[PDB]
């Protein structure tokens, strides 16, 4: 019984251990442009100014 | 935010070639963002013309050593006076 509860015990530090390092890790993950600047204007491409728009101003 | 617009309210002198980087970062991730480097390098030169300084600066530096004359059709500076005159 002793082993036993010894070993449940060292098993749950282990999990923490494990969980620590999961959470380091997918905090250094980069996440997306909606998630981490805007989700509902997502597109990060500007417009610019609309009033004399210039046919061939656009560039891909 | 104002980037982007002109002072007159279109599109400023550099906005296509920040356009196209922006296209690039936003078609990349952070791995591949290098890939992006040659848009962002044209966006600085519209910003400072340093390239092109360079080019001149080679350009004039040549032309200043030569005593040989020049056969091609030239510039001709005018007065705003004689702007369509003749």
């Known amino acids: 019984?002793?082993?036993?509860?010894?070993?449940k015990i060292?098993?749950?530090?282990?999990?923490?251990?494990?969980?620590?390092?999961?959470?380091?890790?997918?905090?250094?993950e980069e996440?997306?442009?909606?998630?981490?600047?805007?989700p509902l204007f997502s597109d990060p491409?500007?417009?610019g100014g609309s009033i004399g728009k210039a046919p061939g101003s656009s560039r891909e | 935010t104002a980037a982007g617009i002109s002072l007159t309210g279109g599109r400023n002198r550099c906005f296509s070639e920040w356009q196209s980087f922006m296209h690039c970062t936003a078609k990349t991730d952070a791995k591949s963002r290098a890939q992006c480097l040659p848009n962002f390098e044209d966006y600085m030169e519209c910003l400072h013309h340093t390239k092109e300084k360079a080019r001149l600066r080679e350009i004039e530096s040549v032309l200043?050593?030569?005593?040989?004359?020049?056969?091609?059709?030239?510039?001709?500076?005018i007065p705003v006076k004689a702007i369509g005159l003749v």
């Open chain 1, 45 to 47: 491409v500007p417009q």
């Open chain 1, 31 to 38: 996440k997306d442009y909606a998630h981490s600047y805007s």
């Open chain 1, 10 to 28: 060292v098993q749950a530090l282990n999990n923490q251990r494990e969980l620590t390092i999961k959470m380091h890790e997918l905090k250094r």
């Open chain 2, 64 to 77: 200043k050593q030569k005593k040989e004359g020049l056969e091609a059709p030239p510039v001709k500076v």
């Open chain 1, 1 to 7: 019984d002793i082993l036993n509860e010894e070993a």
